[PDB]
Design a protein around this nucleic acid. Sequence first.
DNA 1: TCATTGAGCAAATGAGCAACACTATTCGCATATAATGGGGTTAGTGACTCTTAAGT
Length: 79
Amino acid sequence: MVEANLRLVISIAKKYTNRGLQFLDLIQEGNIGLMKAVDKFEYRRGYKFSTYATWWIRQAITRSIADQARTIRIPVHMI
DNA sequence: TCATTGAGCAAATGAGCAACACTATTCGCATATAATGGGGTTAGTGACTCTTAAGT
């Protein structure tokens, strides 16, 4: 299930490119979020995979670029 | 008899600790229609040397 939606990870992380982080770091952290979405996925709500996986991939990419992008790190609640 | 030396002492202030109670920070977790392969250089170098590789 994980190695069939990596194209979804590169499709999400295509837009977060020039935000202070490398392109390969983004899709790596998106893969971490994709694994966390695979482990907690429920099929009985009719949705296929993508509407549940997109939120977790976007969350992992945003929490990656909110912390590991600057030296003087501001937490996400303060920013 | 009194100034001088040797020793100490109560007290005031500066530093700090120990345990406890309130509170502002910080981090783990969740978002359910569908979303399914990227930008970005270097472009009018010169000369020389070392290694690898096809050609003889």
